[PDB]
Amino acid sequence: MISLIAALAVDRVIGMENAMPWNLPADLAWFKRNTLDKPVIMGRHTWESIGRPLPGRKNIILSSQPGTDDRVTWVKSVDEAIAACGDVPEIMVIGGGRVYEQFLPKAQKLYLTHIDAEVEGDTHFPDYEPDDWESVFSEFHDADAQNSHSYCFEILERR
Ligand SMILES: NC(=O)c1ccc[n+]([C@@H]2O[C@H](COP(=O)([O-])OP(=O)(O)OC[C@H]3O[C@@H](n4cnc5c(N)ncnc54)[C@H](OP(=O)(O)O)[C@@H]3O)[C@@H](O)[C@H]2O)c1
Ligand SMILES: CN(Cc1cnc2nc(N)nc(N)c2n1)c1ccc(C(=O)N[C@@H](CCC(=O)O)C(=O)O)cc1
Ligand SMILES: [Mn+2]
C-alpha cells in the first residue's frame, strides 16, 4: 500500500527554497519511526536537500536523469518507482511537492504533521479532498524547549 508522509505548516506550505524552514526535532523522530525499515520514494530535489542516503531504508529517487550515486536506487517513472519497491506491505512517499502530487491518488494513507508556524514557502502540499479521508489517529503537542512550535501528528486513511 502506498502512504504519503509529510510535514505541513500554515497554509499547506512545505518548503522554501529547497529546505524546511522550521526545526522540529519531534517531527524527525516521528518521520524516522514511520519510515524505518521500509522503502522511501522521493523526488530529485528532495534527495538533494537530504544530501545522503537514509539508513535502514531503501532509498528510491525519481529523476528523468540518470543516477549519479550507487548508494541509492534511481527510477524514471512512478510505475517503475513502485515496482522497484518490491512486495512490501507499505511504501513511503516522502516528498517533495511534485512527487506528492503524483502519488496522492494512488495512496491509501496519510501521515501528516500539522505545524503551527507561519512561513512564506514556495512549495505546498496538494489540495486534497477531506471527504475522502478518515482521521484515525491524532495527537497534539505544545511547543517546548526542543520544539519551537506546537504541532500535531495525524493519520488518515482513505475511506
Ligand atoms: N515538509 C515536508 O515534509 C517535505 C518533505 C520533502 C520535501 N519538502 C520540500 O520540497 C521542496 C522540493 O520539492 P519539489 O517539488 O521542488 O521537488 P521534488 O518533488 O522532491 O523533486 C522534483 C523532481 O523529481 C523528479 N521527478 C518527479 N516526478 C517524476 C516522474 N514521474 N518521472 C521522473 N522524474 C520525476 C524530477 O527530477 P528531474 O528534474 O531530475 O526529472 C523533478 O525535478 C523543498 O523545499 C523540500 O524542502 C518538504
Ligand atoms: C530533507 N528532509 C525531508 C523531510 C523532513 N522532515 C519530514 N517530516 C515529515 N513528517 N515528513 C516528511 N516527508 C519529511 N521529509 C529530511 C532531512 C533529514 C532527515 C533525516 O536525518 N532523517 C533521520 C531522522 C533522525 C535524526 O535526526 O538523526 C532519519 O533517519 O529518518 C530526513 C528528512
Ligand atoms: Mn472504507
Provide the residues around ligand 3 (an ion) whose CB is within 5 A.
159
Count the neighbouring beta carbons within 10 Å of the beta carbon of residue 85.
Answer: 20
The pick from 4, 23, 24, 31 for probing ligand 2's pocket by mutation, whose C-beta has the most ligand atoms within 8 angstroms, reads 31
Does the Cβ of 6 fall within 6 Å of ligand 2?
Answer: yes
Domain extent, residue 30, equals: 1-159
| Rounded distance between C-alpha atoms, residue 116 and residue 150, angstroms | 5
Tell me the pairing of strands 91-93 and 2-8. Answer: parallel
Grid coordinates representing 35 are 519510515
Q: Which residue, by CA, sits nearest to atom 11 of ligand 2?
A: 6
The domain that contains 32 carries what CATH number? 3.40.430.10
Is 158 within 8 Å of 109 (Cβ atoms)? yes
Per-residue three-class SS string for the chain: CEEEEEEECHHHEEEECCECCCCCHHHHHHHHHHHCCCCEEEEHHHHHHHCCCCCCCCEEEECCCCCCCCCCEEECCHHHHHHHHCCCCCEEECCCHHHHHHHHHHCCEEEEEEECCCCCCCEECCCCCHHHEEEEEEEEECCCCCCCCCEEEEEEEEC
Kindly give the number of the ligand 2 atom that is closest to the alpha carbon of 50.
1
In whole angstroms, what is the distance from residue 21 CA to residue 66 CA? 29
Question: Does residue 56 have a cis bond before it (omega within 30 degrees)?
Answer: no
113 among annotated binding-site residues: yes
Q: How far is 126 from 12, CA to CA, in rounded Å?
A: 8
Which residues are near ligand 1 (CB < 6 Å)?
Answer: 6-7, 14-16, 18-20, 42-46, 49, 62-65, 76-78, 94-99, 102, 123
A 10 A CB-CB count for 2 gives 18
Give the method of determination.
X-ray
Nearest ligand 1 atom to the CA of 15 is 45
Instruction: Please count the structural domains in the chain.
Output: 1
Q: Which residue has the cell 514557502?
A: 121
